[PDB]
């Protein structure tokens, strides 16, 4: 069985959901936010075992049975209880996410490589030590760190530092002491690329920068740092972002091991869900 | 250089700085809740690597160059910030925190071990495959589960599920569960209470007898501990798994001798175990943090 974990608003898991069904994959589907109500649950640990059940809309599922817990947008737990607590929700927040840790199910992301990789400071580190070509990065807060930073790459661009963005022309960078800022060489971009990689698999697209996602091959390269990208992250799902230069580099920008897929599907009509789905449909 | 991370505060802290001093151990500490303030930091990627630094006072230390961080009770980033805001404290928060994921130090609880280990529930399943004992425990919003489960077991406690008490009546309705995941555990004899603290392999363990009662003015002490072969086998291995260079464990001992696993608190204290039986925790963390990046 197959774990869905998310809002009832999600249109893009619908279309996983009707893949994994096809192939005779059972799937649950509840949103966490629904503890307390419609979700209720078990887990007992005993003589060195466990054994532990899910229920929703009264429907039964052995939490040993779970093969995989795909985590896309799920409310935070119990959050939509008839007397919402943040003591409630971290009461069932732990019951839930505790009790699934350990469970012997595949998450689509890890609830703990997936907390280790919103870290943007970290996805570059990581993207170098990929190979992956990342622009000249400072965030800093001496206004005199990013005064000659300027001076090495005049053409800039500023971005948050958190996981949007601008441009610097001639400046002080004196308010960079009174917050961490992040200012990165600009790329002489002519295409937008999103590369969404399920598993060893490579879903990449393009959008024209000078209209509609259009697909794009993966050059061989950049295919084999995504890989050692997603392995060391061991993310199962990511969502990455490039800009593509007159050469045809692609600058890494930004990994989102959360960030949405259904509208690339839509315009290219790659076999993003039904790739997850397969994922997701292997059993443990 | 070692990296504290803690409020100016932090008395076990200090106890630390000490031993590090004497040894000659070029330590930093710092509360991250002064950044942008007494706190500050760059780092450039640039040509495929990463040089980058941290300033507090006038102090200036390569974050290459660290060999270790301890995190014990820091403040959230720029709180303590002239002008206070969720979203520059977000902002520095991965600022501080992101650059030194990978940055090639020893983590006294690497962050992200850290936020897996708080889960009460995985502590138990993981101490369960680590052959330390584990009491009977019900989790569940099931009136009906719990209502078998004291069937059962009639000698219950009730903790709460989170891990970042009470008795049970002999007949007690257990039909608000459904309204609140409740955490249900056969209670143990209980000798003693036994306090293992880990610094990485070596296991510092106290006992605490239980149970002229009353009237005794709080006079029963923590008492130097031996830690059953087995027991230290399983530990050793419960923190392997979990990624923490320092944890700590409270058992209940049977009375039978067995240490029955109860939590592992990865932040939780030590010192009010040294000062009882003078068991030199502190400098044991001290060395561990001193060891090569």
């Given amino acids: 069985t197959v774990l869905i974990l998310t809002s009832e608003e999600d249109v893009t898991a619908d279309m996983v959901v009707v893949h994994l069904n096809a192939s005779g994959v059972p799937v649950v589907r509840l949103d966490p936010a629904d503890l307390t109500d419609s979700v209720a649950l078990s887990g007992e640990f005993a003589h060195g075992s466990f054994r532990g059940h899910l229920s929703s809309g009264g429907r039964l599922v052995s939490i040993g049975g779970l093969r995989s817990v795909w985590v896309r947008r799920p409310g935070g737990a119990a959050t939509r209880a008839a007397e919402p607590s943040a003591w409630l929700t971290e009461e069932a927040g732990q019951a839930l996410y505790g009790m699934l840790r350990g469970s012997g199910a595949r998450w689509m992301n890890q609830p703990d490589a997936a907390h280790r990789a919103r870290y943007k400071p970290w996805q570059l580190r990581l993207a170098q030590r ?13 206004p005199r760190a990013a005064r000659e930073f300027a001076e090495r790459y005049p053409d800039l661009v500023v971005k948050p530092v958190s996981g949007t963005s601008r441009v610097p022309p001639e400046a002080d960078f004196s308010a960079v002491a009174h917050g961490p800022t992040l200012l990165q060489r600009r790329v002489a971009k002519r295409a937008d690329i999103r590369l969404t990689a399920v598993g060893e698999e490579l879903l990449a697209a393009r959008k024209t920068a000078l209209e509609p996602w259009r697909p794009a091959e993966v050059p061989p390269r950049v295919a084999e740092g995504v890989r050692a990208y997603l392995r060391a992250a061991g993310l199962a799902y990511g969502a990455l972002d490039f800009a593509e230069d007159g050469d045809g580099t692609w600058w890494f920008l930004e ?6 897929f259904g509208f690339v599907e839509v315009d290219t009509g790659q076999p993003i869900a039904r790739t997850i789905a397969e994922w997701l449909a292997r059993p443990g």
């Fill in 130 to 142: 990929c190979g992956l070509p990342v622009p000249a990065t400072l965030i800093t807060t001496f």
């Fill in 255 to 260: 990994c989102n091991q959360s960030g949405q």
